[PDB]
Design a protein around this nucleic acid. Structure first.
Ligand SMILES: Nc1ncnc2c1ncn2[C@@H]1O[C@H](CSCC[C@H](N)C(=O)O)[C@@H](O)[C@H]1O
Lengths: 189, 121, 202, 127, 32, 58, 144, 72, 125
RNA sequence: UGUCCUACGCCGGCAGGCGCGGGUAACCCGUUGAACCCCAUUCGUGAUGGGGAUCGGGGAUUGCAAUUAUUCCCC
């Protein structure tokens, strides 16, 4: 049985949203030992739907300059995050990861159009691929700008953000930004 | 006055070769590398200026272009004028001047000493 | 790339953005000398007490500059976080919470001068379907021409992202009766090119 | 462990205040004339536990470390490691710490002003 | 592969062959 | 290339204002002297105040 | 059958060899052991007070892995990154005198000897001691 | 505003640590430092001491992050 | 009986020699389980875990690795061990095991047997 | 890339100094023991062990000559 970090199973992982079964790739073919693969999942369109989702978090925590290219640090970060989220919650970390991804992707966006001076906003639907991408981006931004100047490490803030977006409580950053975006989309039908 | 715990009288009586250790590293390297003909030339000229002076007041002024002399204790009390590019600055060599170059005492550049529309209609 | 594209000012100017605004040295320095230029750009007479509006007050450092010069002022803003940190700054003048495009709630013949800092550019685009920038700008400019003393002056600082915003703002200003022009401070510069719409009632 | 009964929150050494709630090896650096390197070498010559905090040193420890920073050459702290190596007026190796640093600095400025070299004249023309 | 990488691979394999095959003064006089 | 970019961005701004003017008249009733020839910037003069621009409103 | 140095964890091996050379107590400790930085790119003195035994243990291991290393080679080995102020960083070597004193102390313990073609290399008896301490590391780790 | 984290054990702080830390379900230096208002280095020292007395279970060790939790 | 194969990455090369043995894995003379980055340790260990230690119990391999960086060297090593086992079970063991094992590697990861031909681009004046 | 690149030995804490070899070069520097990275220690939200500007003292080196700081090193 292929296990994340040698101790995390993907067989009991159940994805709830119908919209994203092809776009959250973590199952018996997408189960990997490690979120490092040196994969060329971006040489052709829609290839990144075949990327395992922990590798997508690992690729999306290498941000703001100093951390670019440092992937082993990020594999370490998500590993320690999985241990601490399992200790704090008491169940499979990957399940609340996919839960926070599903509950963090916005379902209705706003586009800005304009002709000359008059600039207005029209509400439009979202692709499932953009749903997963925006959920990953918002969770990474939430953890990153959550810590940045405090005693709490990056892994603890990532796990707390991942819990707080998994259950959907309003103290999470990602669910707040998603609710703001859905509100402006509802106001700009 | 004293310089590194040494008084001027025996400083004049000290040798050329073991005065070298009393100075800083730049001066010691310069004294390692010898002095040129103009150096002893102006040394002889300032000595001649000191010799022909009446013993009550300061000797005459000796002027030069040569800015990279190190002030030695021989020169203490002399009346030296150094070209700063346009004019000559005349300065008395004090005992406190014992380590520096002459060119520090005639600066070759001058200090730099360096309304809104309101609508009526 | 720009704050305007974030959305409505009630959502881009939340608590976190307010706390990054109050702890920002460049904001303090630039907006302070903009308040200086704004107060010097209307020819209100020297040694004469005057009453001013400071709209788009946000932190009230523009209000702190007005109170530094001895003058009293009324602050108007749309974001609650800006007014919260402004009262936390212990500013001298009185604040008020309300949208400027809906209209300024003051009686006519009131203020000796008006100063607006980085706020009129937000009325050039519509972030709601009920919103219409042309009528909103017309209402806001007519409210200026109402609540101001006839013959007073209003300086309106902005950083227009293109000339369409200037076109619409100037058209809605000239159709509200306002006479004046544009002081483009350091016109051909880039880091100091600041647009000041200067207006008066006759 | 727990706070000692003689934990000193504020220390008064060399006419200068010391914040006692810090590691000793940087509470030493809190005054002028000593940085991190000289503090570490002083503490290693003095045979003091650098893991220990500053506020729990006894009077014997503070008096011996003050003694060592006044006369470092006596305690085999080398000549090259010192602040003032050759004083211009009286050639000797020392380590000016609290007020002597300011003294030698301002008298060097007055010396450069009296001789009218470029450096002193430019420095006093800078203000 | 290309010249450079194949050259490095070939010399590396040759050195591995010699170190697998791996696991006194010069003859100063002519006649014993 | 960025030169022509900036230059005719300004030219479009001027043309848009000049085409705003006639319907403004109907429905109702710039640093060239401060431009430096040697460089991009803004050079002070003594006869006139600090560099500025006045575009009056009709 | 005997485990070598190359058969164990290197950090535990270095720490155990440091404990070995400390309990031997016959290395010539320099008089300036507590007042030097190990290279010009350092910012502080080494935080571990008996750093000399650790450095000598690592030096012995490095000569075991690759013979013919002089003082210059060991300064290249322990070189790092100098942060040149507000200027870009660079690679800087170690301090030559520390490496020389470690090598001469190891020769004084007769663990290390010269060769005809260059720098220092391991003695057979020191190599036996190194295999012994490597076996001690393997027993203390792999059998635990 | 300015945090005033304690550099050393107070008596009440030490007692509260000894009888409230061993039931948290998550033991890291950061959580003890933030919810006890103590300096994080001494938080690490206290966690190491609690591990040394055989009362708290270590989960994973790193130079970057160390995590402990309850025995039972 | 023995074979010698190679794997590669950007510049990292690994040359693997595969001989009859008892199940000890050497890379640069050092054991497989002690290569410096532990965070990529399972990336080093995937062929053994997918195939089982029983398929390695009657064979030994030694790999010399030159070039590249840490991660590139690890990827070249895992390509080398996979190609070495495939070549050995092709040449001296029956072909059916070689084909099923090759299928297992290529369904898990193509880069275990096919080189990634990505390198740094050149800059032209 | 190299008749200034440099191995190695000795001295000094460091820049550096002395001697003795190789290289007109896939032959020697060089199996170019690079840095990020990886593993342990200290640090704990503090203009603080972040950040290094600007200065004070001394040493060394290239030059006919370093003053208006050539460059480097230590505090
Ligand atoms: N339509 C509108 N009505 C009222 N206030 C508005 C507004 N659009 C923008 N604003 C206000 O414009 C401000 C921009 S920030 C200005 C801060 C101020 N110049 C200072 O630095 O002191 C915000 O406080 C925002 O709430």
């Amino acid at each position: 049985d292929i296990k994340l970090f040698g101790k995390w199973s993907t067989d009991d992982v159940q994805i709830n949203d119908i919209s994203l079964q092809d776009y959250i790739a973590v199952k018996e073919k997408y189960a990997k030992y490690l979120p490092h693969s040196a994969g060329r999942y971006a040489a052709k369109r829609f290839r990144k739907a075949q990327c395992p989702i922990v590798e997508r978090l690992t690729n999306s925590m290498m941000m703001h300059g100093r951390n670019n290219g440092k992937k082993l640090m990020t594999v370490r970060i998500v590993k320690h995050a999985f241990e601490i989220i399992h200790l704090l919650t008491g169940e499979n970390p990957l399940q609340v990861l996919v839960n926070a991804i599903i509950n963090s992707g916005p379902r209705e966006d706003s586009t800005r159009i304009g002709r000359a001076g008059t600039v207005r906003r029209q509400a439009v639907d979202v692709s499932p691929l953009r749903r997963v991408n925006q959920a990953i981006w918002l969770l990474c931004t939430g953890a990153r700008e959550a810590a940045f100047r405090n005693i709490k490490t990056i892994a603890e803030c990532l796990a707390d953000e991942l819990i707080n977006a998994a259950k959907g409580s309003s103290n999470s950053y990602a669910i707040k930004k998603k609710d703001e975006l859905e509100r402006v989309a509802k106001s700009n039908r | 006055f004293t310089y590194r715990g040494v008084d001027l009288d025996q400083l004049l009586d000290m040798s050329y070769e073991q005065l070298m250790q009393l100075y800083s590293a730049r001066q010691r390297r310069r004294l390692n590398r010898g002095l040129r003909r103009k150096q002893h030339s102006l040394l002889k000229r300032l000595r001649k200026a000191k010799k022909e002076a009446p013993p009550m007041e300061k000797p005459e002024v000796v002027k030069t272009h040569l800015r990279d002399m190190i002030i030695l204790p021989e020169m203490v009390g002399s009346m030296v004028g150094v070209y700063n590019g346009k004019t000559f600055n005349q300065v008395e060599i004090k005992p406190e001047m014992i380590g520096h170059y002459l060119g520090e005492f005639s600066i070759t550049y001058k200090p730099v000493k360096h309304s809104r529309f309101i609508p009526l209609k | 790339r720009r704050p305007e594209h974030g959305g409505p000012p009630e959502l881009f100017y939340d608590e976190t953005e307010a706390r990054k605004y109050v702890r920002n040295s460049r904001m303090i320095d630039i907006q302070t000398r903009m308040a200086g230029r704004a107060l010097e750009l209307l020819y209100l007479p020297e040694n004469k007490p005057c009453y001013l509006l400071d709209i788009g007050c946000g932190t009230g450092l523009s209000g702190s500059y007005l109170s530094d010069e001895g003058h009293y002022w009324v602050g108007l803003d749309i974001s609650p976080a800006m007014l919260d940190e402004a009262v936390d700054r212990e500013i001298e003048g009185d604040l008020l919470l309300g949208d400027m495009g809906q209209g300024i709630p003051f009686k006519p013949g009131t203020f000796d001068g008006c100063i607006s800092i980085s706020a009129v550019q937000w009325l050039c685009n519509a972030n709601k379907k009920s919103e219409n920038p042309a009528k909103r700008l017309y209402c806001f400019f007519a409210s200026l021409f109402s609540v101001l003393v006839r013959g007073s002056r209003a300086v309106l600082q902005l950083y227009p992202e293109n000339s369409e915003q200037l076109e619409l703002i100037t058209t809605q200003a000239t159709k509200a009766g306002f006479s004046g022009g544009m002081v483009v401070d350091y016109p051909n510069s880039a880091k100091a090119k600041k647009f000041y719409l200067c207006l008066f009632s006759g | 462990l727990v706070i000692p009964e003689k934990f000193q929150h504020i220390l008064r050494v060399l006419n200068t205040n010391i914040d006692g709630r810090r590691k000793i090896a940087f509470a030493i650096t809190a005054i002028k004339g000593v940085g991190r390197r000289y503090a570490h070498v002083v503490l290693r010559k003095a045979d003091i536990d650098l893991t220990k905090r500053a506020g729990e040193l006894t009077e014997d420890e503070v008096e011996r470390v003050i003694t060592i920073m006044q006369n470092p050459r006596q305690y085999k702290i080398p000549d090259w490691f010192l602040n003032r190596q050759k004083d211009v007026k009286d050639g000797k190796y020392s380590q000016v710490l609290a007020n002597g640093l300011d003294n030698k600095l301002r008298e060097d400025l007055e010396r450069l002003k009296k001789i009218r070299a470029h450096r002193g004249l430019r420095h006093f023309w800078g203000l | 592969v290309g010249p450079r990488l194949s050259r490095r691979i070939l010399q590396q394999a040759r050195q591995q062959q010699e170190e697998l095959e791996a696991e006194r003064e010069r003859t100063t006089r002519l006649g014993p | 290339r960025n030169k022509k970019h900036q230059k005719l961005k300004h030219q479009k701004e001027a043309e848009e204002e000049e085409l705003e003017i006639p319907p403004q008249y109907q429905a109702g009733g710039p640093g060239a002297e401060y431009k430096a020839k040697k460089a991009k910037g803004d050079v002070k003069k003594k006869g006139r105040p600090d560099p500025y621009a006045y575009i009056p409103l009709n | 059958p005997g485990v070598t140095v190359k058969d164990v964890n290197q950090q535990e091996f270095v720490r155990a060899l440091a404990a070995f050379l400390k309990k031997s107590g016959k290395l010539k400790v320099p008089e300036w052991v507590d007042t030097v930085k190990l290279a010009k790119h350092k910012e502080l003195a080494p935080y571990d007070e008996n750093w000399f035994y650790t450095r000598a243990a690592s030096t012995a291991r490095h000569l075991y892995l690759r013979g013919g290393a002089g003082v210059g080679s060991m300064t290249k080995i322990y070189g790092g990154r100098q942060r040149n102020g507000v200027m870009p960083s660079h690679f800087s070597r170690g301090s030559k005198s520390v490496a020389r004193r470690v090598l001469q102390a190891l020769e004084g313990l007769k663990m290390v000897e010269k060769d005809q073609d260059g720098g220092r290399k391991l003695t057979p008896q020191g190599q036996r001691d190194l295999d012994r301490i490597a076996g001690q590391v393997a027993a203390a780790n792999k059998k635990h | 505003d300015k945090l005033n984290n304690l550099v050393l054990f107070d008596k009440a702080t030490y007692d509260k640590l000894c009888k409230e830390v061993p039931n948290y379900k998550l033991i890291t230096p950061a959580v003890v430092s933030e919810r006890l208002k103590i300096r994080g280095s001494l938080a690490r020292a206290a966690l190491q001491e609690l591990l040394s007395k055989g009362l708290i279970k270590l989960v994973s060790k790193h130079r970057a992050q160390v995590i402990y939790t309850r025995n039972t | 009986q023995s074979v010698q194969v190679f794997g590669r990455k950007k510049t990292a090369t690994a040359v693997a020699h595969c001989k009859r043995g008892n199940g000890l894995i050497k890379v640069n003379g050092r054991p497989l389980e002690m290569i410096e980055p532990r965070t990529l340790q399972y990336k080093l260990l995937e062929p053994v875990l997918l195939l089982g230690k029983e398929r390695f119990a009657g064979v030994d391999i030694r790999v010399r690795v030159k070039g590249g960086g840490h991660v590139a060297q690890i990827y070249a090593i895992r390509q080398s061990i996979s190609k070495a086992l495939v070549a050995y079970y092709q040449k001296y063991v029956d072909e059916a095991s070689k084909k099923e094992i090759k299928d297992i590697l290529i369904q898990y990861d193509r880069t275990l047997l096919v080189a990634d031909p990505r390198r740094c681009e050149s800059k032209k004046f």
